[PDB]
Amino acid sequence: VNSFSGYLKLTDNVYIKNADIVEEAKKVKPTVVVNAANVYLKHGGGVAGALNKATNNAMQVESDDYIATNGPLKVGGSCVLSGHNLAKHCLHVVGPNVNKGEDIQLLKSAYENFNQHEVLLAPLLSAGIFGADPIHSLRVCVDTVRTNVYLAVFDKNLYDKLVSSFL
């Protein structure tokens, strides 16, 4: 039993809710919140910009030190950093950005990072400003993630379409 509330159950291990991931994280304080990161951990907009803003830019400060030490992530890769006031940890995961011409096949590799964590609060990878089809992202999530994932979808219209079209 966990404290995630109001989710629709899609499969044995995948749950979904129309919610602002920032507000969900502040309420639940999950062990892991997933950020929709880019390889430079520049949290300018989308989910990343919102999460970083909620940390009063502490996420960005920590991320800049991470990059200065380690260099950029790989597309499809991840790193674990602090969750600041939102969660114990933040798993920064880089899905492919279609608006950069990045290979959508890398979306499966991106979701594989979730399997290193027993329970996660997450957005749909490569959705929103990353330009991929969110219906496809949900399909890859369900077919790749085996750990318990609670998906927050900000847009109510999109949430309803994801549920109604789910096979």
Question: Explain this structure to me?
Answer:
This protein is an alpha/beta fold and 167 residues long. It has a single domain (8-163), classed as Leucine Aminopeptidase, subunit E, domain 1 (3-Layer(aba) Sandwich). The protein has helices spanning 21-28, 46-54, 58-70, 106-112, 134-144, 156-164, and strands at 8-9, 14-18, 32-36, 78-82, 89-93, 119-122, 148-153. The strands form two sheets. A four-stranded mixed beta sheet has the order 1-2-7-6, with helices on both faces. The chain has a three-stranded mixed beta sheet with strand order 3-5-4, covered by helices on one side. Helix 4 packs across helix 5. The longest helix is centred in the middle third of the chain and has 13 residues, at 58-70. The protein starts with 7 loop residues before the first strand and ends with a helix. It is found in: Host endoplasmic reticulum membrane. May form homohexamers. Interacts with N protein. This is Papain-like protease nsp3.
